[PDB]
Amino acid sequence: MLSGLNHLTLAVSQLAPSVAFYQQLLGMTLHARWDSGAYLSCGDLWLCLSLDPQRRVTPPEESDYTHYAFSISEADFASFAARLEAAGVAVWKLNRSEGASHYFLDPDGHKLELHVGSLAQRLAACREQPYKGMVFF
Amino acid sequence: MLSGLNHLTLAVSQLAPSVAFYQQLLGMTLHARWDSGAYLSCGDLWLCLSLDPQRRVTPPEESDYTHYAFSISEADFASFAARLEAAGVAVWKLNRSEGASHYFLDPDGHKLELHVGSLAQRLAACREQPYKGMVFF
Numbered sequence: 357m358l359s360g361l362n363h364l365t366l367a368v369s370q371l372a373p374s375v376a377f378y379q380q381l382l383g384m385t386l387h388a389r390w391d392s393g394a395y396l397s398c399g400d401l402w403l404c405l406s407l408d409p410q411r412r413v414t415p416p417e418e419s420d421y422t423h424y425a426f427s428i429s430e431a432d433f434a435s436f437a438a439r440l441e442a443a444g445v446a447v448w449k450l451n452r453s454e455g456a457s458h459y460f461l462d463p464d465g466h467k468l469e470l471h472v473g474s475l476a477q478r479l480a481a482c483r484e485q486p487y488k489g490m491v492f493f
Numbered sequence: 494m495l496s497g498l499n500h501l502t503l504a505v506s507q508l509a510p511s512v513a514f515y516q517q518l519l520g521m522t523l524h525a526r527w528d529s530g531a532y533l534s535c536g537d538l539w540l541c542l543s544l545d546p547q548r549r550v551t552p553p554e555e556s557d558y559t560h561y562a563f564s565i566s567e568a569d570f571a572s573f574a575a576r577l578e579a580a581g582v583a584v585w586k587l588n589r590s591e592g593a594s595h596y597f598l599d600p601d602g603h604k605l606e607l608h609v610g611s612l613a614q615r616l617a618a619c620r621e622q623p624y625k626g627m628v629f630f
């Protein structure tokens with residue numbers, strides 16, 4: 357039986373700029389780097405960057421809604437989002453609201469998000485302002 | 494600062510087969526569903542399925558190496574892999590590393606993995622037998 361996420365692996369087109377993005381800009385911990393990959397952590401998350409010549413830099417209008425959200429506290433959210441905008445990080449748009457979030461792209465067009473709040477808080481907010489057709493189990 | 498992964502959102506082409514896969518086949522807990530999505534949990538992982546008309550059922554040869562690995566114990570690994578094989582789930586890669594991994598596809602072609610072992614265990618193995626160009630920090 358499954359117990360959670362073991363690791364997230366992102367395919368990247370150029371290793372050095374991607375390591376710089378996740379380590380220098382987002383502040384993840386770099387544990388190891390080799391000619392074709394890197395291992396980073398963010399709290400409990402094991403992130404692997406894997407050099408892949410198949411990876412294409414895709415505009416957000418032509419990629420689907422698959423995306424990866426990172427937790428940040430209420431106190432740090434705005435100042436962290438402001439730092440990303442000042443660094444010229446591009447944005448993308450989701451079709452629906454899901455609370456306090458900032459949506460941004462990595463150098464290869466992976467869709468990232470900063471989000472404040474847990475699943476439990478999201479469900480409680482949705483009880484008051486449900487999505488269309490929502491049912492709770 | 495970022496404190497971990499908040500949620501993983503997968504774009505899906507049809508909600509019902511994706512809920513069946515993640516809830517019934519993989520055993521994740523379904524918390525809520527609406528006209529265009531669902532929220533599930535797997536241990537401490539919050540998973541969102543988002544219905545997206547942009548999502549193509551993508552063959553594994555046409556997508557890059559980006560993938561999502563779930564944690565499982567060694568004791569449960571072989572029986573879980575056998576369950577996936579009985580259900581007809583396609584495999585996209587053979588395991589060619591030491592640790593136990595099973596590489597399988599979801600109904601829309603998202604690349605998934607079952608993996609036994611932590612980052613610390615991988616780093617220890619790599620310290621003994623480093624990859625080409627490997628530097629530790």
Ligand SMILES: CN1CCCc2cc(CN)ccc21
Pocket residue numbers: 389390391625626627628
């Ligand atoms: C940390 N550092 C900066 C200079 C380029 C570079 C390359 C590798 C892979 N051979 C590992 C570390 C590193």
Ligand SMILES: [Mn+2]
Pocket residue numbers: 423425454469500502
């Ligand atoms: Mn999100």
Ligand SMILES: [Mn+2]
Pocket residue numbers: 363365560562606
């Ligand atoms: Mn993997």
